[PDB]
Amino acid sequence: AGVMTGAKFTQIQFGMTRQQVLDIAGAENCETGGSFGDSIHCRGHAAGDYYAYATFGFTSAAADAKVDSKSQMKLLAPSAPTLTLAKFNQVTVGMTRAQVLATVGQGSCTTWSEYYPAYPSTAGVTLSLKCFDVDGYSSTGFYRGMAHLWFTDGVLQGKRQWDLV
Amino acid sequence: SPQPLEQIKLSESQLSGRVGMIEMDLASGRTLTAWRADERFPMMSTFKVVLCGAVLARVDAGDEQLERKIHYRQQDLVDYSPVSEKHLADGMTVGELCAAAITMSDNSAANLLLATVGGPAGLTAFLRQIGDNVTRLDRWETELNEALPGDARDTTTPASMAATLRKLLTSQRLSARSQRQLLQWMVDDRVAGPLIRSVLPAGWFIADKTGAGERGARGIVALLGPNNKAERIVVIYLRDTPASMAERNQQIAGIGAALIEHWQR
């Protein structure tokens, strides 16, 4: 059983039904309605003044609706964080995702949110990454060197950073 | 079980931290128990009660509506924003933003609300307006949680915070409707389980707001009392300790438990 985890987040896939998501996540960790509309929000371990979590968005309120959005906080760690303030300054709006990763470090990032507004088409796909310096990521507390990089159609639209270098 | 001040000294010793505490009579405003009450502590998310107080003041004045929808963008999203990030495409009402800020410590929600009251400087001006000359907000989320030692930015004191909470919730500086709404958001707090709620006896009322920050910073502001009626304000802040979150929560809960055990003693 357990609470929401990175493993469960990874096992949950775009195109899944609400019931499929609940079965993997563990229903006792999850909620819908209220603050979360028709999305499903699943709590992991306590972190800071909230919890690590995942949030799954769906194509509609229908029972057969499919996951078209995956978001997570503090369920996943970067594989090899090498981001620096210098590298962040080399990142430019208009860059492709591939160019950005080459700039900030290939193992520096985790996916914050990914949404296909035209699912199953990829048109208009929005993606938010968090990229971290060597000691920037924390699964239980506060980041100490993180950049938010956001894309539409795989092209960087903006960037922000905290505590880099 | 130790007396409140005994428990606080035990907690400071065990945490190697600094605790700030006020216990205040809600009706009279009298200070009943105090510890480091004039020392500064980072507010963290506890500032959001003051924030939404300022928002409600604008509603009372007809300069704001809780039903007003605010639209925002990716650039506005910061860490710890579980609710606001979900509504990115649709926007959120002012009231929904306050609910998220208070009950879930939603950071981006708080930043959106801060902009409506003139930013940190605007909120600080509101505080001065209501007679709080101590509490200050200087930065936005997420920097306001940095809690650097000796940094006066984004701090309050237990004494000032207690007085200001009393002003916002009972002084009729806010309309009755606004006072009820602010209190309701605090009643509906979702993230305060491990703190005073964990030691609150059956049948008691509680309304609260928590905070967590870097460098061990942790806090709670609360109204509570027996017979399902608010009787006192309790403010507890912690700063400057390397202790785990579990330990920090346990100590704050224990201080709350001491206040409750010695409620009439």
Q: Summarize the helix and strand pattern of chain B as letters.
A: HEEEHEEHHHEHHEEEH
Assigned CATH architecture of the largest domain in chain A: 2-Layer Sandwich
Overall shape of chain B: it is globular
CATH topology value of chain B: Beta-lactamase
Oligomeric state of the chains present here? heterodimer
InterPro entries (chain B): Beta-lactam/transpept-like, Beta-lactam_cat, Beta-lactam_class-A, Beta-lactam_class-A_AS
Active site (chain B): 45, 143
Function (chain B): Broad-spectrum beta-lactamase which confers resistance to penicillins, as well as first- and third-generation cephalosporins. Has nitrocefin-hydrolyzing activity. Inactive against the cephalosporins, cefotaxime and cefoxitin, and the carbapenem, meropenem.
Pfam family, one (chain B): Beta-lactamase2
Which SSEs are present, and which pair or pack?
The complex is a heterodimer of chains A (165) and B (265).
Chain A: H1 6-11, H2 18-25, E1 30-31, E2 40-47, E3 50-58, E4 67-73, H3 85-90, H4 97-104, E5 109-115, E6 126-132, E7 146-152, E8 155-162
Antiparallel strand pairs in A: 1-2, 2-3, 3-4, 4-5, 5-6, 6-7, 7-8
Chain B: H1 4-15, E1 18-25, E2 31-35, E3 41-42, H2 47-60, E4 69-70, E5 92-93, H3 94-104, H4 107-116, H5 119-129, E6 155-156, H6 158-170, H7 176-187, E7 205-212, E8 218-225, E9 232-239, H8 245-261
Helix pairs in contact in B: 1-8, 2-3, 2-4, 2-7, 3-4, 4-5
Question: What does this entry look like structurally?
Answer:
The complex is a heterodimer of chains A (165) and B (265). Chain A is α+β, with helices and mostly antiparallel strands. Chain A has four helices and eight strands, in the order H-H-E-E-E-E-H-H-E-E-E-E. Chain A is 17% helix and 33% strand. Chain A has an eight-stranded antiparallel sheet with strand order 1-2-3-4-5-6-7-8. Chain B has eight helices and nine strands. The N and C termini of chain B lie close together (11 Å). In chain B, helix 2 (47-60) runs antiparallel to helix 3 and helix 4 (107-116) crosses helix 5. Helix content of chain B is 38%, strand content 17%. Chain B has a five-stranded antiparallel sheet, sandwiched between helices. A two-stranded antiparallel sheet of chain B has the order 3-6. A two-stranded antiparallel sheet of chain B has the order 4-5. By secondary structure, chain B is of the alpha+beta class. Chain A binds chain B through residues 35-37, 39, 41, 46, 48-50, 53, 55, 57, 71, 73, 113, 117, 126, 128, 140-143, 146, 148, 150, 157-158, 160, 162, and chain B through 44-45, 74-75, 77-80, 82-83, 85-87, 89, 96, 99-100, 103-105, 142-143, 145, 191, 194, 210-214, 245. It is classed as hydrolase/hydrolase inhibitor. Keywords: Beta-lactamase, Beta-lactamase inhibitory protein, protein-protein complex, blip, SHV-1, Antibiotic resistance, Hydrolase, Plasmid, Secreted, hydrolase-hydrolase inhibitor complex. The assembly is dimeric. Crystal Structure of the SHV-1 Beta-lactamase/Beta-lactamase inhibitor protein (BLIP) E73M/S130K/S146M complex.
